[PDB]
Symmetry: C4
Subunit: 238 residues, 4 copies
Amino acid sequence: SHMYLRITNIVESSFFTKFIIYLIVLNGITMGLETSKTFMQSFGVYTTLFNQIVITIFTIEIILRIYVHRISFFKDPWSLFDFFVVAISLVPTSEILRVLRVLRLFRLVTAVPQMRKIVSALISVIPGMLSVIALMTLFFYIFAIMATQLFGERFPEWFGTLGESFYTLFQVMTLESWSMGIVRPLMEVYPYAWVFFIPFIFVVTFVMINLVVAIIVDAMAILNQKEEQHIIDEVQSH
Amino acid sequence: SHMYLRITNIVESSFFTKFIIYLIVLNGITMGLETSKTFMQSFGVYTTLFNQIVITIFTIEIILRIYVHRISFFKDPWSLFDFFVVAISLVPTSEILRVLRVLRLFRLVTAVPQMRKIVSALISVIPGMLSVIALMTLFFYIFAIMATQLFGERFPEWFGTLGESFYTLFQVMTLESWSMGIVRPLMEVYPYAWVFFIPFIFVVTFVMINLVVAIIVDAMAILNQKEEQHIIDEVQSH
Amino acid sequence: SHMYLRITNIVESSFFTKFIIYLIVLNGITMGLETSKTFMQSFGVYTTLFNQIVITIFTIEIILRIYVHRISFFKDPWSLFDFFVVAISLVPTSEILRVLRVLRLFRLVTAVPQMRKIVSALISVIPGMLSVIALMTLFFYIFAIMATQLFGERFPEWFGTLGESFYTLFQVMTLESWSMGIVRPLMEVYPYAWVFFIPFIFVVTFVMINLVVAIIVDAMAILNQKEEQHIIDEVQSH
Amino acid sequence: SHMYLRITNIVESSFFTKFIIYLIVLNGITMGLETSKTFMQSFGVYTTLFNQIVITIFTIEIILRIYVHRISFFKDPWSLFDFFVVAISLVPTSEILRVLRVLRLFRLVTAVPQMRKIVSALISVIPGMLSVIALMTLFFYIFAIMATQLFGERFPEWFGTLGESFYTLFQVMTLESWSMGIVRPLMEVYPYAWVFFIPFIFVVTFVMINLVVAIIVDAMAILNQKEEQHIIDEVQSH
Ligand SMILES: CCCCCCCCCCCCCC(=O)OC[C@H](COP(=O)(O)OCC[N+](C)(C)C)OC(=O)CCCCCCCCCCCCC
Ligand SMILES: CCCCCCCCCCCCCC(=O)OC[C@H](COP(=O)(O)OCC[N+](C)(C)C)OC(=O)CCCCCCCCCCCCC
């Protein structure tokens, strides 16, 4: 425990975390700079060693943080993310992984409380949304099957395959070129194609909007219930 | 009644409904798989018999459910949907019906309470919206007539027919290519076309947004009224 | 007054207004039908006389309604609209007016209370919005001037004229083809064009959204204030 | 102080500010008119002197306003804006500055209280949004780096440079031609490009919407807290 607490006070120190954030911001600049072939032709040699240094320093940090937090480390999503992001960056350059190394810049999120809270807040709405996401995903699935069968023979790029139809249906949901780009061309062969995509557009837009309405209104319903118990307590007491 | 209750306990059992959901999920996978010509060339023979089996099993189920629920069955929208969806799947392969058979996968909605409640909730906002939908539909109708008369001679694909103008006006409402794709081309012949579509875009966007504003605010007004009676009861009593 | 009240009871009768609505719906169908050249080649002779009849009947109605309501008629927006819409339909076929005759179908709005209330509600948010509309219109005006000066020489169709720039800026505000269709082409000559349109897009989207936020939140603030006085009255009294 | 108060009563007078607003509106019309080459060929000589006069009058005004307000002037954002906008207009015609002179029309905002309040209100939501903007900007930055590395070699116009990728990613965020215009072309070379842009679209849309949800709900939570203390005070007192 003597050796344990020595490490704990370092890993727990504000200098330690401020150092890591320093590295993250420095390496973030570096990774932008490595985007210029000009910059790489000259200073590229330096930035590569720096990225190797940062990676090793983050590996030492992850190791220390694990000795200090023990099993608690692997039950913490933030440090799980720090773990896998640093682990990715450790795969030898031997290819999409070289690109996924950029994800280590998200450590600026996992290391800054203001950023964690923002992400925690945004993520908190999702659990209640799961069943609606499942409903909408079943909806997409059923319509991707139908679209593949209706249109995939004449329009294989857009509908020749379940995956392609899934892609196009998502495009239609964002409303991107849905008419000039997909449905008008379809209607030159299938004049009733609009009977398929208009109702599809209605459901998916209607569901999106009503999802937002329900979150705002149900949130404020709770706010009211919480205020209601507070006022009713006082009137009963005083 | 002896024979009645025997069936009722089966049709009402959790195994019965869990079985049907099992079938729905299995058949849902099957229908995705039947999308691959590769898969069909090999295993296609099996999946066709399976779809025939599921269809017969669902027909037995609908029949049983009707003997158990009697007239209540046909006054229940969920089982009405199960009815017609299974009824569609019964039309002999002799063509758009073959595609509409996929709709039977929506039985996963009508059989899962979490999904029913979601759909019930989303549908509940619609009754209050009917008169606004009618207003907006009258609006579309009047503008489709005018557009057909103004533009249908020179731009028949987009406006040559009430139905075509209805289609294009919906496209303009989603804002999809409304300018580069429709109104700029129109303005090369009708320089004042923008006097028609800009105001059209204003009304339809303004109405959409204010529909959402009114639902949120009127919902919370009720929440307040309900909270108001509760607090006022206490102050009067205690 | 003897002759006055005789007319008043007719013009005020439910049959009278139900008749007019009947005519409006009949003529609305007629105007859709007159959209088919096929239909016009055959039954066109009949529908033209019918439109002449409806127009005369509405003119008699407007006349009666004016004798009954006196100056109150011309201070009523609904009957002002009925007036001008019927007045338009009276201009001899000698051309855009022939099209504006379709607007008489909006009388189905001004004659049906459910529709009036809907329109009244939607319109009620506008007065409070006037100064923001003016702000945003000044904003459009300043940017249309700048855009004309920056881009109108090389891109006259999109920016050669204040009016054209106004049009394109509205297009950019709806986000329709703003990049692939306008700003990327502009940037082939003016690489810094994005410094103009991105901030423009930020302001206009930010203002729209915050307009909606402010209506919902200020509405509910009032709802709270109104609930607050009610509860505070009770606690003081009981 | 004798000379000071003489100026103060003029600079503070309602005539003074009404005069300046008059000039702003007159010059605003002028600047629209100077947009027509026709108008400039004829009356152009007059409007140029008028713009020189207005500019000098505004410079006298800024000078007076500074003698009256002293250091308070340069701590006031509204008069800081009036300052720099008039200062821009003072740079000799020797080029983008000639265009930025139009910004002086925004003085109609800084001189009209109704407009100031509107702008103040809209701006007030921003401070609380800063950390989310930073989060989203870090997000854009990380994805612009990855996109440059994944796609910049084959698609240099859209992704060849951090700045270009930043631009395209903003375009994808507005949903403008994201599929037909960017991702489908990308997928002809990188079939898994959708694994990059779909999740990107999900995050950025999800964050936008939840930003709006959080402002409305947190605003009303405060409204409730404020109402809660008021009602609880009464029940305790009466
Ligand atoms: C609960 C979820 C409900 C889901 C609602 C959406 C249902 C989808 C409706 C399908 C609409 C059909 C769109 C369409 O045009 O598909 C193509 C088919 C076949 O094309 P077709 O017109 O026969 O000519 C093609 C000939 N060819 C290939 C040699 C050129 O075109 C046709 O076969 C024309 C017939 C269109 C029938 C549309 C009526 C379907 C109503 C939906 C059934 C109720 C479901 C609850
Ligand atoms: C309170 C409201 C604030 C409003 C904010 C918006 C202000 C608008 C900024 C203008 C951005 C300039 C966009 C642009 O590229 O316009 C074109 C000019 C001139 O083109 P240029 O690059 O000189 O080459 C053209 C040569 N040619 C014609 C023979 C091919 O391009 C250039 O001259 C390049 C220089 C761009 C300067 C951008 C910096 C302006 C910052 C805004 C000033 C602060 C205002 C408060």
